[PDB]
mmCIF file of C-alpha atoms and ligand atoms in Angstrom:
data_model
loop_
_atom_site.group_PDB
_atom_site.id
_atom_site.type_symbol
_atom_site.label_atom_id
_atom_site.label_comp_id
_atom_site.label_asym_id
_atom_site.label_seq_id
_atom_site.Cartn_x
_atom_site.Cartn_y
_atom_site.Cartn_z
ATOM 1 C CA UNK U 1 0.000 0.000 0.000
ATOM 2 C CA UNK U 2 1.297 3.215 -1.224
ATOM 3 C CA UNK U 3 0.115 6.539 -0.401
ATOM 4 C CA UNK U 4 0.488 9.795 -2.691
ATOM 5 C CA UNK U 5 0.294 12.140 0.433
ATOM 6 C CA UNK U 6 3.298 11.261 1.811
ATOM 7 C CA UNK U 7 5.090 13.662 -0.577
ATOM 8 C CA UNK U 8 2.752 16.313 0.043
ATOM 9 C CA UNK U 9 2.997 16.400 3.413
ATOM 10 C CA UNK U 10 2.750 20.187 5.058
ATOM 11 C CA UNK U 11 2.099 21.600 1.704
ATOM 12 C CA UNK U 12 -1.403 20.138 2.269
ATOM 13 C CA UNK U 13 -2.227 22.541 4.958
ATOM 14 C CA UNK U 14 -0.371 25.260 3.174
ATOM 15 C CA UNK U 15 -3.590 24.787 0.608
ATOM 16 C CA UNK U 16 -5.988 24.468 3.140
ATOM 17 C CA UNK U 17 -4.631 27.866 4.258
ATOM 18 C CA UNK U 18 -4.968 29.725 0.964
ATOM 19 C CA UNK U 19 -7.462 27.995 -0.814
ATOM 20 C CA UNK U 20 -10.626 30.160 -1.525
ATOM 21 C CA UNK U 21 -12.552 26.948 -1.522
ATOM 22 C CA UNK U 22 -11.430 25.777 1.918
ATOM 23 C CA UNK U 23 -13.303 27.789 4.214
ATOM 24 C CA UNK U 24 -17.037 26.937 2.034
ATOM 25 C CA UNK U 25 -16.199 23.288 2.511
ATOM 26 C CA UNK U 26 -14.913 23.128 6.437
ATOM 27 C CA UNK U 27 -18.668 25.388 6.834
ATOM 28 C CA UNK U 28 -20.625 22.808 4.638
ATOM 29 C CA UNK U 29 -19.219 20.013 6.908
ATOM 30 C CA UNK U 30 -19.613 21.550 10.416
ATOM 31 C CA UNK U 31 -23.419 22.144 8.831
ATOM 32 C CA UNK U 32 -24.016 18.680 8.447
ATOM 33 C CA UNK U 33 -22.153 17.088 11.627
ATOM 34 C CA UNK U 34 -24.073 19.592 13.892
ATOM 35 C CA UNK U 35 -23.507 19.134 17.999
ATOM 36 C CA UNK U 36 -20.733 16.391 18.592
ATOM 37 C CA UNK U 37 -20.698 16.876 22.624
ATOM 38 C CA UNK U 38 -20.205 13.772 24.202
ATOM 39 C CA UNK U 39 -20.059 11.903 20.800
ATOM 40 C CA UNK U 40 -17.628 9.465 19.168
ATOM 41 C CA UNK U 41 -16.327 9.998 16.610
ATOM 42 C CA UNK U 42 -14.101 8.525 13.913
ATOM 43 C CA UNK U 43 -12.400 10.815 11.320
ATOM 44 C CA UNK U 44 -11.932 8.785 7.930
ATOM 45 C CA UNK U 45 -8.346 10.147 5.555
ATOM 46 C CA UNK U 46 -7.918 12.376 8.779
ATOM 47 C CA UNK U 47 -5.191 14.002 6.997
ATOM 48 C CA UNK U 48 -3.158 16.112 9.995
ATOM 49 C CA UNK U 49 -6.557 15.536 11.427
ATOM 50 C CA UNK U 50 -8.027 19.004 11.082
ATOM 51 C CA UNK U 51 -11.841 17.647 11.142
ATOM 52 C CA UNK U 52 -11.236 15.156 13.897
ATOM 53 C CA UNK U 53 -9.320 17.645 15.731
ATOM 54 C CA UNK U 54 -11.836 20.576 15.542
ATOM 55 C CA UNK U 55 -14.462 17.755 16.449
ATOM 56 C CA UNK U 56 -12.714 17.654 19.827
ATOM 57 C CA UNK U 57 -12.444 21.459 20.362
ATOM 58 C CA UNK U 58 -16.091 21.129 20.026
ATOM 59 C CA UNK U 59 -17.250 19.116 22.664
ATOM 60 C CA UNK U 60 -16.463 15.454 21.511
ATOM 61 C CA UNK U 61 -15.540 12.621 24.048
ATOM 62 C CA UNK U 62 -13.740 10.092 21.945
ATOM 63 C CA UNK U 63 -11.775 11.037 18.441
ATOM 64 C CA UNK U 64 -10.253 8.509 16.147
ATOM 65 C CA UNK U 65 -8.351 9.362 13.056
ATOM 66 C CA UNK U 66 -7.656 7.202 9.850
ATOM 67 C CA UNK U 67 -5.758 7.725 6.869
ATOM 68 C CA UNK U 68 -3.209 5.989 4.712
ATOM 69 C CA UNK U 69 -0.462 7.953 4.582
ATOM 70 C CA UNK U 70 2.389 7.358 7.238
ATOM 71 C CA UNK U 71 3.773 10.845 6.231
ATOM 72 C CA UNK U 72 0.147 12.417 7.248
ATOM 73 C CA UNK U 73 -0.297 10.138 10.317
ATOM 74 C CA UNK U 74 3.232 11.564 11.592
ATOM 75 C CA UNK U 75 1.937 15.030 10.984
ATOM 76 C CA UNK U 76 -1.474 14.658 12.981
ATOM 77 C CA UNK U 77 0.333 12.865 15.745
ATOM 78 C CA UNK U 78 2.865 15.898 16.019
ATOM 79 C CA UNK U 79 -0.258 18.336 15.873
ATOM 80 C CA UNK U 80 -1.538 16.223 18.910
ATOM 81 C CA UNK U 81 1.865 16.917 20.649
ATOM 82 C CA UNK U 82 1.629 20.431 20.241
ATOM 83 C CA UNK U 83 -1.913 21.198 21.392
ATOM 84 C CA UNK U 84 -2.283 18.373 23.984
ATOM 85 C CA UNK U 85 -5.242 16.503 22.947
ATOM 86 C CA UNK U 86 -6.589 13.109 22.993
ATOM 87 C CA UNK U 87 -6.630 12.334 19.317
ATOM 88 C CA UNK U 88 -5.767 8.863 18.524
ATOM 89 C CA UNK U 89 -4.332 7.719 14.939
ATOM 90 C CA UNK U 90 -4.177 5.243 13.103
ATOM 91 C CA UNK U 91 -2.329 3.444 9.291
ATOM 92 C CA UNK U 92 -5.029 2.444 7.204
ATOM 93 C CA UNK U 93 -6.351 1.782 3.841
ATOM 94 C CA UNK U 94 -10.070 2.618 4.441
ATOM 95 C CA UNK U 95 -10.794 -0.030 1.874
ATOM 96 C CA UNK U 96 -9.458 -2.890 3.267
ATOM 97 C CA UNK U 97 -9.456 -2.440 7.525
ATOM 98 C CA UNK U 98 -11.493 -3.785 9.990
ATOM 99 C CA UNK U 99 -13.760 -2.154 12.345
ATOM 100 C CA UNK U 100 -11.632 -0.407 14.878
ATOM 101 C CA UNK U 101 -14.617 0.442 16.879
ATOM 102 C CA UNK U 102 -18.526 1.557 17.261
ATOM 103 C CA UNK U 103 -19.271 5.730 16.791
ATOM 104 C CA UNK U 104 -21.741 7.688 16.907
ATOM 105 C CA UNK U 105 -20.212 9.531 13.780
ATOM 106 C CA UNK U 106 -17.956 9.009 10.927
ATOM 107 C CA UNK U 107 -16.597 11.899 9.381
ATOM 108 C CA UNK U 108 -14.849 11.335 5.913
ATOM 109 C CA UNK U 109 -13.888 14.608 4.015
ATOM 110 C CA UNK U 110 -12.084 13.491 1.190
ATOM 111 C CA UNK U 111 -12.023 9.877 1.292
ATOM 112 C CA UNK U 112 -14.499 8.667 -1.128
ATOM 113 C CA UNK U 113 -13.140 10.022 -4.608
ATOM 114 C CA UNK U 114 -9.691 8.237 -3.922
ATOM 115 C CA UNK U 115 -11.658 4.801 -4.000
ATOM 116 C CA UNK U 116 -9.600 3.133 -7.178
ATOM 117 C CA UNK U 117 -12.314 1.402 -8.419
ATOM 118 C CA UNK U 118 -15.889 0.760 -7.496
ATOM 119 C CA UNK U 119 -15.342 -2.600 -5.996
ATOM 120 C CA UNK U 120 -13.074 -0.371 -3.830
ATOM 121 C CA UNK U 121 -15.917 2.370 -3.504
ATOM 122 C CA UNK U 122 -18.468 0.043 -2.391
ATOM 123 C CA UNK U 123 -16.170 -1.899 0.283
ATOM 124 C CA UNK U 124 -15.398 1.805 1.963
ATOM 125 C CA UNK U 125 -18.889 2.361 2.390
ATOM 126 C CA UNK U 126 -19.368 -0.965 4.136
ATOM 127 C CA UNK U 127 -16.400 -0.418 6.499
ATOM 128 C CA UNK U 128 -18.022 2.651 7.688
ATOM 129 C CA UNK U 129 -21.060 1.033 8.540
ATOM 130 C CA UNK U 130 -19.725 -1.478 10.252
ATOM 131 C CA UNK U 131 -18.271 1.413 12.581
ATOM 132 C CA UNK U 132 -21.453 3.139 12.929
ATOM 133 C CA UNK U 133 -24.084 3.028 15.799
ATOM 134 C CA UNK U 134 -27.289 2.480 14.965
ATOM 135 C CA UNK U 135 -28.424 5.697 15.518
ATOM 136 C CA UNK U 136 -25.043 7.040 13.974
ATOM 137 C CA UNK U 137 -24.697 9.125 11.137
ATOM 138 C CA UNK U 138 -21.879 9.183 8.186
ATOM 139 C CA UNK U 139 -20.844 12.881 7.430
ATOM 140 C CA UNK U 140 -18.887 12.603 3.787
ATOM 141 C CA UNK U 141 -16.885 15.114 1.506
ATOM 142 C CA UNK U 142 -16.200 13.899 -1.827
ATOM 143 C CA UNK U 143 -16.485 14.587 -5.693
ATOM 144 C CA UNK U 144 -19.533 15.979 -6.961
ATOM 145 C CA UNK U 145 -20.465 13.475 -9.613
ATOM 146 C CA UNK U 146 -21.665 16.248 -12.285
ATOM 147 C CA UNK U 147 -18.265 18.168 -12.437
ATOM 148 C CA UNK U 148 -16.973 18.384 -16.040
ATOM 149 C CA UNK U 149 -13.668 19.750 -16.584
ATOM 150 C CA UNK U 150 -14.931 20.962 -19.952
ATOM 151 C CA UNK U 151 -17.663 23.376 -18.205
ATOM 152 C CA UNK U 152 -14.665 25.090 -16.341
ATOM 153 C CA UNK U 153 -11.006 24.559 -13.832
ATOM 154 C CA UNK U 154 -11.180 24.964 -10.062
ATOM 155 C CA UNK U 155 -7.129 26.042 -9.911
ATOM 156 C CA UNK U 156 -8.489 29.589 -8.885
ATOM 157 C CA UNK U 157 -10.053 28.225 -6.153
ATOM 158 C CA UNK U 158 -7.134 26.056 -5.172
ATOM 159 C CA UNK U 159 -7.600 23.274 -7.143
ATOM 160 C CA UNK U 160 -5.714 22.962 -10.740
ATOM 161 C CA UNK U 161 -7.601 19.714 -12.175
ATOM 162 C CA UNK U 162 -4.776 18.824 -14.962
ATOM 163 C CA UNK U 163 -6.851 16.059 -17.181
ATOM 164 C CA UNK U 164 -10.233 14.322 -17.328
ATOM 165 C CA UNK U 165 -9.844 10.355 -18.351
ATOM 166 C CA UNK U 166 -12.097 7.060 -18.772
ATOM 167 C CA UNK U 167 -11.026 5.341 -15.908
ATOM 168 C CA UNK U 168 -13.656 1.920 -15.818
ATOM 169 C CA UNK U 169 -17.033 3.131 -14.647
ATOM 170 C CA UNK U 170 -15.970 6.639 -14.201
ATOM 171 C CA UNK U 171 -13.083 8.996 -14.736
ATOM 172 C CA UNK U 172 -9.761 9.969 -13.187
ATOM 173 C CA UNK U 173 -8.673 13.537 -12.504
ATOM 174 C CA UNK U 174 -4.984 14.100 -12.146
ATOM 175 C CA UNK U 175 -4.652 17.606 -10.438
ATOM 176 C CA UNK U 176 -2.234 19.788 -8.352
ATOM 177 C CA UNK U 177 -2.592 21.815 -5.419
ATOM 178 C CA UNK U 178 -2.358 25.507 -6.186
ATOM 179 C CA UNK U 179 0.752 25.530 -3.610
ATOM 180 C CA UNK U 180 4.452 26.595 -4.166
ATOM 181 C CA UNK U 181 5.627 24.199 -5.379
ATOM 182 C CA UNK U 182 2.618 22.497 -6.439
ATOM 183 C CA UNK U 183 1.411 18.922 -5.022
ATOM 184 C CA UNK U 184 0.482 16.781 -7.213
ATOM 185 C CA UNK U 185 -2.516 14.278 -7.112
ATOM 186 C CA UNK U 186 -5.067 12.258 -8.412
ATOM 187 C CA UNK U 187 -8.675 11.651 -7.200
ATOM 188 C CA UNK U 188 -11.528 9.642 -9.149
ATOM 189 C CA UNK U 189 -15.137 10.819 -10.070
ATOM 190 C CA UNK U 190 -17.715 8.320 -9.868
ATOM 191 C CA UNK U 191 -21.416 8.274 -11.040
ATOM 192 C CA UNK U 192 -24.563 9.255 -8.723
ATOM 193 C CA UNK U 193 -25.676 5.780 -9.607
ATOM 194 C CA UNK U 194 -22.599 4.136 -8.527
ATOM 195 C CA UNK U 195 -22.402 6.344 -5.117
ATOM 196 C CA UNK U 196 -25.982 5.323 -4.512
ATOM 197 C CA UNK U 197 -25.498 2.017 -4.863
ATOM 198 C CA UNK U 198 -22.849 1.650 -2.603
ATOM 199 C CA UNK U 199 -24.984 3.540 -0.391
ATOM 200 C CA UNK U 200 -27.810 1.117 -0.146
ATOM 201 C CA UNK U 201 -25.711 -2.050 -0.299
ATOM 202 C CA UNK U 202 -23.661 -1.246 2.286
ATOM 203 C CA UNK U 203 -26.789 -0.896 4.854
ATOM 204 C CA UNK U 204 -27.798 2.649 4.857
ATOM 205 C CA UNK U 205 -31.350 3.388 4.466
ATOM 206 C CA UNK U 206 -31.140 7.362 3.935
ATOM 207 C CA UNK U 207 -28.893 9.363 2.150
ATOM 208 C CA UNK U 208 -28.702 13.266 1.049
ATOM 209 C CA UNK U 209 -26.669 15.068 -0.776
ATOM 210 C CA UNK U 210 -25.700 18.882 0.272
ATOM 211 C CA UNK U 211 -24.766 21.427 -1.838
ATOM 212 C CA UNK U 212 -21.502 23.759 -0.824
ATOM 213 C CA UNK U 213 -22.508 26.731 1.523
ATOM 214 C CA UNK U 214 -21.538 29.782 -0.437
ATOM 215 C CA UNK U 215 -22.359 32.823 1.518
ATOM 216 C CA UNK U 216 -22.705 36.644 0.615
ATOM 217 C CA UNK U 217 -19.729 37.401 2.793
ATOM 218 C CA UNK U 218 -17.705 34.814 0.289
ATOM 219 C CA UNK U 219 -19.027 36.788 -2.868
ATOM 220 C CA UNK U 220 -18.221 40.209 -1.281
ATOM 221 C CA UNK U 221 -14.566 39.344 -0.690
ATOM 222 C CA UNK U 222 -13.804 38.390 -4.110
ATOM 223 C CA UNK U 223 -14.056 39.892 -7.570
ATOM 224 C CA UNK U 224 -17.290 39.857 -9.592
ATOM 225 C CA UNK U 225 -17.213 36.777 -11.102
ATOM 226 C CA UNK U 226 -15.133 34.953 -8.938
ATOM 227 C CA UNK U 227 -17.597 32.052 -7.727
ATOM 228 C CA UNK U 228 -18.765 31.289 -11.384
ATOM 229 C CA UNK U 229 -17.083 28.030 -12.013
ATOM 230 C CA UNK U 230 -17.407 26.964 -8.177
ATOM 231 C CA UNK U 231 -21.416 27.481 -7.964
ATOM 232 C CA UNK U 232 -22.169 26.226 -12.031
ATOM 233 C CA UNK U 233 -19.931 23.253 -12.305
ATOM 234 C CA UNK U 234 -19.473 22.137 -8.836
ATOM 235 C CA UNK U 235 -16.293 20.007 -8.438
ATOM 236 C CA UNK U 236 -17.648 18.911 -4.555
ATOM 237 C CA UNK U 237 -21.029 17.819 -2.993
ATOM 238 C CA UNK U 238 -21.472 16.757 0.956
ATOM 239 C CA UNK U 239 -23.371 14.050 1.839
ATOM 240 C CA UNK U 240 -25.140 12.456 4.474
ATOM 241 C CA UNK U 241 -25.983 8.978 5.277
ATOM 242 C CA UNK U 242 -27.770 7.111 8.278
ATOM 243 C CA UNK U 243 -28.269 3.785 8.549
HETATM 244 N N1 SAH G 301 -7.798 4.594 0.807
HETATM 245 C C1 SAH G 301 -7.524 5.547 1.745
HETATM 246 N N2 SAH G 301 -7.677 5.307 3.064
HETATM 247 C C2 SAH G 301 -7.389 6.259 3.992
HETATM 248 N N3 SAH G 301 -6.962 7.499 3.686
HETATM 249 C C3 SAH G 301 -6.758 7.853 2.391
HETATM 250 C C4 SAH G 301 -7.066 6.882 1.341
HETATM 251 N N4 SAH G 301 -6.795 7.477 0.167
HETATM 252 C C5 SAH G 301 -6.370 8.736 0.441
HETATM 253 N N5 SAH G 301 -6.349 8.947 1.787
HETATM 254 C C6 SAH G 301 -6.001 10.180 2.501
HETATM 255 O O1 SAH G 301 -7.012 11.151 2.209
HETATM 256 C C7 SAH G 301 -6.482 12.453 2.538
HETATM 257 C C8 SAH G 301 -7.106 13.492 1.599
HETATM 258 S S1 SAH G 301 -6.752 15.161 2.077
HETATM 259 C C9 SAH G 301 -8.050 15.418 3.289
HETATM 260 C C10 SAH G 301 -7.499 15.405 4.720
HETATM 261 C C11 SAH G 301 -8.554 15.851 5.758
HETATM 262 N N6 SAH G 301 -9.774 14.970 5.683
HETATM 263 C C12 SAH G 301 -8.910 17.291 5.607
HETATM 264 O O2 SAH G 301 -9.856 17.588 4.874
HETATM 265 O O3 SAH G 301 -8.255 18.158 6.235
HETATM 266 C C13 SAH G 301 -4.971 12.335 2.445
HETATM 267 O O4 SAH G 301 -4.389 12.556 3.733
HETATM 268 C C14 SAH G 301 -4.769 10.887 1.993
HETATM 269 O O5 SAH G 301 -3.557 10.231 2.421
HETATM 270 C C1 AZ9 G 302 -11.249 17.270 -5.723
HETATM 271 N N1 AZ9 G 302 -10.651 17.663 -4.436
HETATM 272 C C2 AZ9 G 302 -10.855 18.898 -3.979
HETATM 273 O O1 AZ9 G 302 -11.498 19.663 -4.648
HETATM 274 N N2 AZ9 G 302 -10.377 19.351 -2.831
HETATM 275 C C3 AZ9 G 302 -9.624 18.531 -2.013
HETATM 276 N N3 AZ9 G 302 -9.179 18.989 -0.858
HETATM 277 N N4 AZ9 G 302 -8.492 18.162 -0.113
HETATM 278 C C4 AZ9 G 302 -8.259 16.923 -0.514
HETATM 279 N N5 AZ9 G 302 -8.689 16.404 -1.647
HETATM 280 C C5 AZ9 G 302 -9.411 17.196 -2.436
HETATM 281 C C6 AZ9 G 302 -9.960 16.768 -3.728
HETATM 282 O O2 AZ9 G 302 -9.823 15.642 -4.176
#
């Protein structure tokens, strides 16, 4: 198991830092989770564990972080040094571990569109059901099945997607981070139907899909014009699943 991130490393919260688009998608996702006091949680391609981490500022018991990188995993435990909080990591291919536990919520921002395949996407979803409570709820970031590179680039919002190419099922996006230098990487797009599907046989009986928060404050602090691309041809959705 290999794992791109580890050669992005602390460039990746250098983006997260000056991307236009990070601030709509960390308000999206604290939208959806809602309260998390007294809730556990486990935070799915944690990264250096910004959601999981933030989930603890906010009042949650017992925090868990995934992700596959070892370079990443490093990072988040040093972050967990440095602030003194109880945020627990661990090595793992979403797609192939075993339940490490039972939470109230799973949290996955950006785990979904670097399934491989859809055998891959649909073995994911089951994993985080069978980490769920019953009367749990899976918070997800992940590719908005409708982007088309054709109807416009998200590099001015952070994101420079290089390519758009048949990839089985769906297609794969090879892309950079609008960092200096920039970090290269490549995520996967997968179909509505194929999402949905992996939905429903992995046990969850309701899902929604969320549209990015873009608020008048966002508009005002940019040119006219700016939030074209980002609000006509979407490049991420949130979504919410219960089982
Ligand atoms: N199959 C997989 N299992 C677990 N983590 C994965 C994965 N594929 C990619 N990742 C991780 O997904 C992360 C995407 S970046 C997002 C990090 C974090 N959720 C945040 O938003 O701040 C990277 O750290 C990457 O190593
Ligand atoms: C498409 N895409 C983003 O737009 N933003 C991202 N931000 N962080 C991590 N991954 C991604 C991603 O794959």
């Amino acid at each position: 198991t290999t794992a791109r991130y580890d050669s992005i490393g602390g460039l990746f919260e250098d983006f997260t830092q000056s991307a236009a688009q990070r601030a709509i998608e960390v308000r999206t996702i604290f939208h959806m989770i809602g309260d998390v006091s007294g809730k556990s949680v486990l935070d799915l391609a944690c990264g250096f564990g910004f959601f999981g981490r933030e989930i603890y500022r906010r009042g949650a018991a017992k925090v868990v972080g995934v992700d596959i990188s070892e370079k990443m995993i490093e990072l988040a435990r040093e972050e967990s040094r440095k602030y003194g909080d109880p945020l627990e990591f661990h090595v793992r291919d979403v797609a192939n571990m075993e339940p490490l536990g039972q939470f109230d919520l799973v949290n996955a921002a950006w785990l979904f569109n670097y399934a491989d395949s859809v055998e891959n996407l649909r073995k994911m979803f089951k994993v985080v059901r069978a980490s769920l409570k019953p009367d749990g709820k899976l918070v997800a970031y992940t590719v908005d099945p409708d982007f088309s590179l054709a109807k416009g680039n998200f590099a001015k919002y952070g994101v420079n997607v290089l390519n758009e190419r048949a990839w089985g099922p769906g297609y794969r996006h090879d892309a950079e981070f609008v960092t200096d230098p920039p970090s290269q990487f490549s995520f996967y797009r997968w179909s509505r139907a194929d999402y949905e599907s992996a939905i429903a046989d992995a046990g969850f009986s309701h899902f929604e899909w969320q549209k990015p928060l873009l608020e008048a404050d966002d508009i005002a602090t940019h040119p006219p014009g700016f939030w074209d691309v980002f609000q006509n041809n979407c490049l991420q959705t949130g979504l919410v699943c219960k089982p």
